[PDB]
């Protein structure tokens, strides 16, 4: 039996740039226990009808998990361009799977403010689909060789989400899980 | 290796870095204002100092990119809005001398006291005591005594301080590629864009005078009315062919004429519109007023309030022993956090103030998606003008009848229309000449046109010609009367109040025409008119991202200021005043003096 209950009820989630991935295979996946969670902000599915989701079979299931803002959920879609979808996580054009997102303001926010949830904002070139970038090298914009020091025209590549409980609705932490299916 | 690049990255870093420090400072300030304790006092400074230091550090690095080469207008606006530094360009000692001068100017104004006759005691201050006398007293002697005492106590002390202030500020202005400090103030109206949307600073003055010359015919026939009424109050101290004394206008300075309503009523036999009794008969409370404001706002086609707005805002005075400032303010803490702080009551004035303050929240909510450095009104004169039209539209008899405070049997009347128009006129039209004269005097004194030996002479000479007010006692050069105002002792711009009045009536006329309204403009109501929302919503979203000319054109259809809607608002009052002043005299001759 596939342990989706660990993925959708994980006590700790991972950041967006170092996003977590889990593999599911050789087990019977109950897709009806995904509707027993909290109401979902977005449940877009591409290529597989949910009512026929239990009526098909697949070889492997890849589950990707991360936490992002509320204004950035719309960037997790095929063909869309932006900042998170061009520097953090890129989705293939002919994607065949489903996307689930839900609000976790109470669980993932503190009065002082979380500063361990961070994201990347500078990169030389776009990302090929399903690619992870963990390097923490100092960004280069001009021509002076930055000697690994954050000076003039030399920038650090990562910045932190300042999650706080008194924010609005488009800035609270949102947890996103993407399921992708394999048939070969 | 470009300057279009290496500037986008800097702004992208700066936005995300500053959006947290600004939020922390705003939250600390709100915590100070909600409950006042010393621990919060310390935190307020701990946040403000960090924010100011970080902003100064960023401004130090930003100027390394010359702005001439930047071709994109959007990036250029964000870059140029930050290159302004201020007093940091002056000398180290000159920077502290100006701060000391400003502090020693500000400290006197709140600590001013005047002696009382026949007893050493009863020394009154400005805010608690003298305001009451200038508001309710009807004796010539007491008003003259207070008017002379205030300017003999504070003015004679504040003059050398102002003489140093002008020199230091003029050096500050010339240090930053500007001509004078007046040119520094007029830098808020500079717009760049297409070949027709270009506005230079020098064009502002010629637009103030050109628009003022049409307000003269109406004002001259309001003044000539009020004077006659004053002849009843003081039988032998008003000249029928002369100006008006300065200490009889119902205010310490003369900024507003609203306190003169009880003395100058057109028809005093008819009760004014007041619906406070029906607000308590029906059983309203503090929350229902704001709910009714929200319903009105959602009627026109605007978004409703957030879920958190009801949870964080302080709509009532707390009962747990916490002391508050208790003044109506609208706060935009950033990152989707909007709040309103006021001591709501069940009075009609509070019912209007709710709408006025809720207008600011909608305006701020409109441009929350814009970049951080362009989250402000197009010019200083829109952010208050947008909110006042809502108060104008929520005080009409039709809207009140629709809500439920009035029956159908209430029929509007000619005399009540005249009364309401005159009450509006005294507050609105009676302040324009004062503002225009004060701003012109400050502009002409910054440039050094008037030497230090001819200040009061020119001041009291222009008082007679523009406003028609004559001093009650002679003043030599030792006095300094302009410094008696709040906005002169403390450095604040004063031209926003002139432009706001014009804008609020251009907008009202445009919206009224949008909603297919027939009849006098003063009874317009934009309730349940969807097409009147989008026309507004187009402007509110722009912010500072575009020159204010295009933002104005999106609503009014014109490109600059115009006074036609203002004169359309007061047309029946103008006709009635022209009818009542048949056997009288209009104008004033600038030679009569009361002291002789
Ligand atoms: C998620 O885990 C917690 C851990 O105690 C548990 O109480 C809760 O029931 C789980 N969720 C569901 C839907 O069972
Ligand atoms: Zn306002």
Residue numbers in the entry:
A (entry chain B): 335 to 518
B (entry chain A): 19 to 614
The authors write:
SARS-CoV-2 uses the receptor binding domain (RBD) of spike (S) protein to recognize its host receptor angiotensin-converting enzyme 2 (ACE2) and mediate cell entry. We measured the binding affinities of rabbit and hare angiotensin-converting enzyme 2 (ACE2) with receptor-binding domains (RBDs) from SARS-CoV, SARS-CoV-2, and its variants and found that rabbit and hare ACE2s had broad variant tropism, with significantly enhanced affinities to Omicron BA.4/5 and its subsequent-emerged sub-variants (>10 fold). To elucidate the molecular basis of rabbit ACE2 binding to SARS-CoV, SARS-CoV-2 PT and Omicron BA.4/5 S proteins, we solved the cryo-EM structures of rabbit ACE2 in complex with S proteins of SARS-CoV, SARS-CoV-2 PT, and SARS-CoV-2 Omicron BA.4/5. Q34, a unique residue of rabbit ACE2 compared to other ACE2 orthologs, plays an important role in ACE2 recognition.
Meanwhile, Omicron BA.4/5 and subsequent Omicron sub-variants, BF.7, BQ.1, BQ.1.1, XBB, and XBB.1.5, showed significantly strengthened binding to rabbit ACE2s compared to PT (KD values from 11.6 to 49.2 nM). Notably, although the same molar ratio of S and ACE2 (1: 3) were mixed during the sample preparation, the Omicron BA.4/5 S adopted a two-RBD-up conformation and bound with two ACE2s, indicating a more open conformation. Omicron BA.4/5 RBD forms more H-bonds with rabbit ACE2 than that of PT RBD (12 vs. 9), which may attribute to the enhanced binding affinity. In Patch 1, two additional H-bonds between S19 of rabbit ACE2 and N477 of Omicron BA.4/5 RBD were observed, whereas in Patch 2, Y449 of Omicron BA.4/5 RBD forms two H-bonds with D38 and Q42 of ACE2, and Y501 forms an H-bond with K353. As for the enhanced binding affinity of rabbit ACE2 with Omicron BA.4/5, Q493, N477, and R498 are shown to exert an essential effect. In the Omicron BA.4/5 RBD/rabbit ACE2 complex, R403 of the RBD directs toward Q34 of rabbit ACE2 and forms a H-bond in addition to the H-bonds with Q493 and Y453. Besides, the S477N substitution of Omicron BA.4/5 RBD brings with it two additional H-bonds with S19 of rabbit ACE2, strengthening the receptor binding. The R498 of Omicron BA.4/5 RBD, on the other hand, forms a H-bond with Q42 instead of K353, and on top of that forms a π-cation interaction with Y41. When binding to Omicron BA.4/5 RBD, the RBD interfaces are largely overlapped, with Y473, F490, and S494 exclusively binding to human ACE2, and R403 and G496 exclusively binding to rabbit ACE2. Q34 of rabbit ACE2 mainly interacts with Q493, which was substituted to R in the Omicron BA.1 variant and later underwent a reverse substitution event from the Omicron BA.4/5 sub-variant onwards.
